[PDB]
């Protein structure tokens, strides 16, 4: 960690300057949208919207009623 920090200290202070001069100390959303634009130009968007759902705060688990809905609609027994 400290090795790549030493390798990228210029980068950290550079986009630090750019964050203060563009949106005024807004490193989080700028660096986030940089990750999103890069990994969507990567054309592997499953990881991208996975990161979007996890950093927005989308819940992993779901409602019981939706489980009931999919169980009824697929006609599955309680054992399976």
């Amino acid at each position: 960690r400290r090795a790549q920090k030493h390798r990228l200290r210029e980068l950290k202070i550079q986009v630090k300057e750019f964050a203060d001069k563009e949106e005024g100390g807004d490193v989080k959303a700028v660096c986030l949208t940089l990750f999103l634009l890069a990994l969507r130009a990567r054309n592997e968007h499953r990881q991208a919207d996975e990161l979007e759902a996890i950093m927005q705060g989308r819940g992993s688990g779901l409602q019981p009623a939706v489980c009931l809905a999919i169980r009824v609609n697929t006609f599955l027994s309680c054992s399976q």
């Binding site: 949106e23 807004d26 959303a29 700028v30 949208t33």
Partner: peptide, 6 residues
């Protein structure tokens, strides 16, 4: 904010 942008 930036999140509001496309």
């Amino acid at each position: 904010h930036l999140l509001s942008l496309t």
